[PDB]
Amino acid sequence: ISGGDAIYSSTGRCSLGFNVRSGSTYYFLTAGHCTDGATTWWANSARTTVLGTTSGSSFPNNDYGIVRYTNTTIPKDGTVGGQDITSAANATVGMAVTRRGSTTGTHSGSVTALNATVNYGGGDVVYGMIRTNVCAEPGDSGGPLYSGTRAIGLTSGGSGNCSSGGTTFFQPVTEALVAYGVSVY
Amino acid sequence: VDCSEYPKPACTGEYRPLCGSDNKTYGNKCNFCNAVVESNGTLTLSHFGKC
């Protein structure tokens, strides 16, 4: 399973952001809003292939969570779909990026702003977000934002849709990497 | 589902579908409620789950 693939929790479906590891422990990052209140994650709708359990979740304020893998045999590719990812980097205004998610597949665009605040309401406010002109729809939360073989962010949310165009905000991946002491491979 | 605190400028993107009266599957509550607003209150919830 790789970046952009569907993940299912108890309550719904999100997308895997990046496979990461620490030492010999494998994990995957996804959105914090998807990890919040989820314990176990599966690879399919039927909930028959287990992936693992949530190890951390940070949302609102930030929007990142991490799941430790407990399934021993499923392949954990360090890619996004077939794309290899070899490092993480900070987003910059005008950077060309690409997102992949379990609902809309792959879409590209550019970083239009940094450090934005997105208010999802109800006191769910997230800060520090990367703004872009890439579209995203329900189910794509937590999938990767990357540029080339560089990991850049995790889909958090925004507005619009892929038919008419939209605005999507991503959580900077460097920040989750550092919070958890893990790294892309 | 109550869309009174809507609209909202952004929605998270987890998928927990709802079926609207326009027969469209809305991917989650924030998306369904912003469309309700957008229709100026004419779209209603037909049922939970996909259409």
UniProtKB/Swiss-Prot annotation, chain A:
Domain of life: Bacteria
Protein name (database record): Streptogrisin-B
UniProt similarity note: Belongs to the peptidase S1 family.
Active site: 33 (charge relay system), 63 (charge relay system), 141 (charge relay system)
GO molecular function, one term: serine-type endopeptidase activity
Catalytic activity: Hydrolysis of proteins with trypsin-like specificity
Presence of keyword Protease: yes
GO cellular component terms, A-Z: extracellular region
Disulfide bonds: 14-34, 135-162
Subunit structure of this chain's protein: Monomer.
GO biological process: proteolysis
Keyword terms, alphabetized: Disulfide bond, Hydrolase, Protease, Serine protease, Signal, Zymogen
Function: Has a primary specificity for large aliphatic or aromatic amino acids.
Protein species of origin: Streptomyces griseus
Protein EC: 3.4.21.81
From Swiss-Prot, chain B:
Compartment(s): Secreted
Domain called Kazal-like: residue spans: 1-51
Glycosylation sites: 40
Residue pairs linked by disulfide bridges in the UniProt entry: 3-33, 11-30, 19-51
Taxonomic superkingdom: Eukaryota
Positions bearing the site annotation: Reactive bond 3 for chymotrypsin, elastase, proteases A and B, and subtilisin: 13-14
Domain notes: Avian ovomucoid consists of three homologous, tandem Kazal family inhibitory domains.
Name this protein carries in UniProt: Ovomucoid
Span of the entire protein shown here: 135 to 185 of 185
